[PDB]
Design a binder for these strands. Structure first.
Ligand SMILES: [Mg+2]
Ligand SMILES: [Mg+2]
Ligand SMILES: [Mg+2]
Ligand SMILES: [Mg+2]
Ligand SMILES: [Mg+2]
Ligand SMILES: [Mg+2]
Ligand SMILES: [Mg+2]
Ligand SMILES: [Mg+2]
Ligand SMILES: [Mg+2]
Ligand SMILES: [Mg+2]
Ligand SMILES: [Mg+2]
Ligand SMILES: [Mg+2]
Ligand SMILES: [Mg+2]
Ligand SMILES: [Mg+2]
Ligand SMILES: [Mg+2]
Ligand SMILES: [Mg+2]
Ligand SMILES: [Mg+2]
Ligand SMILES: [Mg+2]
Ligand SMILES: [Mg+2]
Ligand SMILES: [Mg+2]
Ligand SMILES: [Mg+2]
Ligand SMILES: [Mg+2]
Ligand SMILES: [Mg+2]
Ligand SMILES: [Mg+2]
Ligand SMILES: [Mg+2]
Ligand SMILES: [Mg+2]
Ligand SMILES: [Mg+2]
Ligand SMILES: [Mg+2]
Ligand SMILES: [Mg+2]
Ligand SMILES: [Mg+2]
Ligand SMILES: [Mg+2]
Ligand SMILES: [Mg+2]
Ligand SMILES: [Mg+2]
Ligand SMILES: [Mg+2]
Ligand SMILES: [Mg+2]
Ligand SMILES: [Mg+2]
Ligand SMILES: [Mg+2]
Ligand SMILES: [Mg+2]
Ligand SMILES: [Mg+2]
Ligand SMILES: [Mg+2]
Ligand SMILES: [Mg+2]
Ligand SMILES: [Mg+2]
Ligand SMILES: [Mg+2]
Ligand SMILES: [Mg+2]
Ligand SMILES: [Mg+2]
Ligand SMILES: [Mg+2]
Ligand SMILES: [Mg+2]
Ligand SMILES: [Mg+2]
Ligand SMILES: [Mg+2]
Ligand SMILES: [Mg+2]
Ligand SMILES: [Mg+2]
Lengths: 111, 64
RNA sequence: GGGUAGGUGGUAAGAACCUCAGAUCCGGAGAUUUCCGAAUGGAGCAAUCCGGUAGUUGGAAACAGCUAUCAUUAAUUGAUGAAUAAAUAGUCAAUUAAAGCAAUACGUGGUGAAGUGAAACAUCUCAGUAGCCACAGGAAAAGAAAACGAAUGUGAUUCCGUGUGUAGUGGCGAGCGAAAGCGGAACAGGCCAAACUUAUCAUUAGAUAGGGGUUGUAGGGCUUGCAAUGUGGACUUGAAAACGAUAGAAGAAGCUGUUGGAAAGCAGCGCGCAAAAGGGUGAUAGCCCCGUAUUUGAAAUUGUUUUCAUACCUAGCGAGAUCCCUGAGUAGCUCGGAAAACGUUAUUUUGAGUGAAUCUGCCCAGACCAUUGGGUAAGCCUAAAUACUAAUUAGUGACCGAUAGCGAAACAGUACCGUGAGGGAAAGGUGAAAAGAACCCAGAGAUGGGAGUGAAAUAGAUUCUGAAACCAUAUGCCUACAACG
RNA sequence: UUGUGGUAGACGAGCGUUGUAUUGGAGUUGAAGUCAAAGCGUGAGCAUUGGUGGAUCCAAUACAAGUGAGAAUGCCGGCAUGAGUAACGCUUGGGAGUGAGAAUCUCCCAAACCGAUUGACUAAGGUUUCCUGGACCAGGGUCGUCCUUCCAGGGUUAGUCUGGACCUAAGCUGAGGCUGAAAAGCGUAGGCGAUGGACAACAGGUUAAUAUUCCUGUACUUACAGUUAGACUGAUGGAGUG
RNA sequence: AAAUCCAGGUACGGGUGAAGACACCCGUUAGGCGCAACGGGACGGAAAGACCCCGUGAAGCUUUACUGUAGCUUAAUAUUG
């Protein structure tokens, strides 16, 4: 399975942004990146191009989007625990459904 | 080729040594001669064999 | 089958979809596989043209779709059949194999030079090398003594060390150079012909298919007895098990502060280890991530080994007879060559000619003869150690790091040169992240100057660092009566 | 105390580069590289500081070398000198327009050369160079708003034309077959092979680019089937013509 | 653009010198730098002299040079009575 999936809450443990909590919107496995909303906001200088029906307007000024972040800098956020902390996860397989599930190793919380 | 038809024995390549031991490549050819071999009273083919094989056939009462 | 939550190959954003009834992706097994090309229906200037035959569907037929088949050679079988009665030659049909390519590498065989050295050159060397051709194989070749050789000797072949640069061989010059013995790697010995016998061929068999036999301290056959039902193979089919190969699963351990754009660096306090190999993460991380040590797992295909059964092959010691068999244009010999270290010679081989004997036999022990001794030619097959790497997996380097390393780090045998064979380059690095510079000014525009992003824009796509030669600008000094390495 | 010129040459002692092995040390508070400066050594050589640079490097003792560049009419790359020099490879003037910019682009009027040709149709070859619009990185021996250059789109219509589905010449290939150490060479029957033979379409119009091909008009030729009438049909071979 | 180019700030007379000097010795002359000319010199440039000699160099050709050989011719022997 994968450490980070599309949807789970995640934070950053290194870089300029420390303790930045967000939701992963999309995961690129090949480049080992991850787009997390609200973090790594870059502002491309949007030019103007008019060669299509939609390009006839293409209103783009100082649009702030999302920059991808290396998957190593991401860490899963705990929610079930009363005192939330950042830890590592296991890949135990519960015989109830025989499906692999991530479980933290500093607690007993699933996913 | 200049070779027997019963056997496959062909030419023999060697050296032509003379006085002063000068080397020149030469070829010994087999004594190919025409002969007719009867086989069950028929097919008297005019095969081309060497004299050695001809002598063998003669001593074998023309058997091949 | 594995495995998930993403995917629609790269220069590549966007549009439109697919995907939790399990996608994309990885592995095993299959399906489809245009035309040229061994090309093989015929041709031909390769990737084109022109068909025949037998079916089947439309048409009223020509015709047009949709299928299968149609080359040559060799072997076997059957039919037909000339000169010429029979019979062959030939013709036709059916079945089975062969064609070709490559691994710039190893093997065998045929053919086979020259540059060069000898300080010239012809014998000789180079060299049985290069090249040309034929045939393979996973290795090939060789192979079970008519042997070595001088002894109370060894007992197939192959490869390594030594014997030794020794005995020898050489216009005795340049040079060439073993075979014994000894120490090692591996080790395996089998099977036909003839006798004798069985059955069948107008049985003129001198032929076909069986039993019997495979040799040297001679063997086998002929007749007559004892002991045998085993051990072992280079061996066929099956069944079972084990060890693997082709995807994978799990896989421990860290926070704080400081410089900094960014920590993983530094410092403090800790922790894990059968994991301190490595890669990435904004600098230099055992504890951030992927992994590694370790424990594991295969539906399907495939490799090795073992066990059981089952085919095939595989068996000792006597007696008497005194009879038969033991590989012929063969071994020798003569005339020309060659192989062996030998420049031809005892041994091996052959183009021409001639030509033996049959265990009281034949060959050998460097001319040759006698004594002694060794061995059984003229028939075949043979695993292992040995030679090599185009390719698949893992890994290593006191090997290279864009003039180096393969000619080729990039789309290189490309661009390009030549009618053709053939010859044959150069060229890598923005930044952690394109956040690749919106906007303003001059300009026709590229572009430049600001602004903005960024730690850095003198990192700006001309994109790591940026040397010298070379070209320009400038502070200071000197230079227009002056013969200048 | 005696000495210390020196080529060929002999001998001895050292420096420097890259990497490896053992020790220690420095480095985003800035390593290598790289530039400058008024330093230290007997020599190869070695430091200090500052600028640029952005991640490795240094000292000691040993070890191994693709280990030291000024010359080879040396190889490769760059840049000078000659020198803004020779040369720019046969064809004039003006008006109007476009354009930011015009001797060179567009149009018009002349002018000058070709006129058995610089005119027109095609074979061979070339392979999109053809037409339209746009552009002025590069190429054009100047310039360029323009080009046979570049970009985007488009363009080649056959029963009668040129060649196959027809035929042969020189010649090539060639089952069998002959010859030859091998590869192969020769060659019969067959099969290819035009630069030749046989074979039915002419006139006009149309698009920016095609036209005996598309359109209009009028024709012709060869096959197959049905039908009417007449006739016995007559080749893979013989003969004539070709 | 081009061949060329050791670095140049590149006079003349007599002498000297590897024997014919822009550069040496002794004298004479000459302000710095161009442009257009013409060729005296720079033993000017282009071509590792083709002439000559040397090399125990190469190649072509010739002959009663040497050693061989294709081909031609003669004899023995086998096919061969
Ligand atoms: Mg010779
Ligand atoms: Mg599946
Ligand atoms: Mg020679
Ligand atoms: Mg010599
Ligand atoms: Mg010599
Ligand atoms: Mg073998
Ligand atoms: Mg895992
Ligand atoms: Mg882990
Ligand atoms: Mg690390
Ligand atoms: Mg003998
Ligand atoms: Mg020899
Ligand atoms: Mg005996
Ligand atoms: Mg003797
Ligand atoms: Mg024998
Ligand atoms: Mg290279
Ligand atoms: Mg380079
Ligand atoms: Mg070409
Ligand atoms: Mg700028
Ligand atoms: Mg530059
Ligand atoms: Mg640079
Ligand atoms: Mg003055
Ligand atoms: Mg004066
Ligand atoms: Mg003077
Ligand atoms: Mg002076
Ligand atoms: Mg001295
Ligand atoms: Mg070192
Ligand atoms: Mg520095
Ligand atoms: Mg060197
Ligand atoms: Mg030059
Ligand atoms: Mg100049
Ligand atoms: Mg001049
Ligand atoms: Mg002039
Ligand atoms: Mg001029
Ligand atoms: Mg002109
Ligand atoms: Mg003019
Ligand atoms: Mg005129
Ligand atoms: Mg013309
Ligand atoms: Mg073109
Ligand atoms: Mg045009
Ligand atoms: Mg235009
Ligand atoms: Mg121009
Ligand atoms: Mg028509
Ligand atoms: Mg034809
Ligand atoms: Mg013609
Ligand atoms: Mg036209
Ligand atoms: Mg120049
Ligand atoms: Mg003198
Ligand atoms: Mg000379
Ligand atoms: Mg000579
Ligand atoms: Mg010579
Ligand atoms: Mg004669």
């Amino acid at each position: 399975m994968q450490r980070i999936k599309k949807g789970d809450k995640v934070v950053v443990i290194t870089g300029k942004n420390k303790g930045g909590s967000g939701i992963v919107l999309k995961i690129m496995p090949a480049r080992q990146q991850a787009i997390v909303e609200g973090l790594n906001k870059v502002t491309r200088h949007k030019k103007k191009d008019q060669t299509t029906k939609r390009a006839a307007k293409q209103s783009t000024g100082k649009v702030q989007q999302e920059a991808p972040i290396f998957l190593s800098k991401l860490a899963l956020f705990d929610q079930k625990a009363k005192q939330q902390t950042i830890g590592k996860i296991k890949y135990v397989m519960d015989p109830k459904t025989n499906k692999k599930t991530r479980v933290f190793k500093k607690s007993n919380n699933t996913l | 080729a200049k070779k027997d038809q019963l056997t496959l024995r062909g030419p023999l390549y060697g050296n032509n040594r003379s006085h002063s031991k000068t080397i020149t490549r030469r070829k010994w050819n087999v004594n190919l001669q025409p002969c007719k071999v009867k086989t069950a009273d028929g097919k008297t083919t005019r095969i081309l064999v060497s004299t050695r094989t001809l002598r063998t056939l003669k001593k074998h009462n023309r058997l091949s």
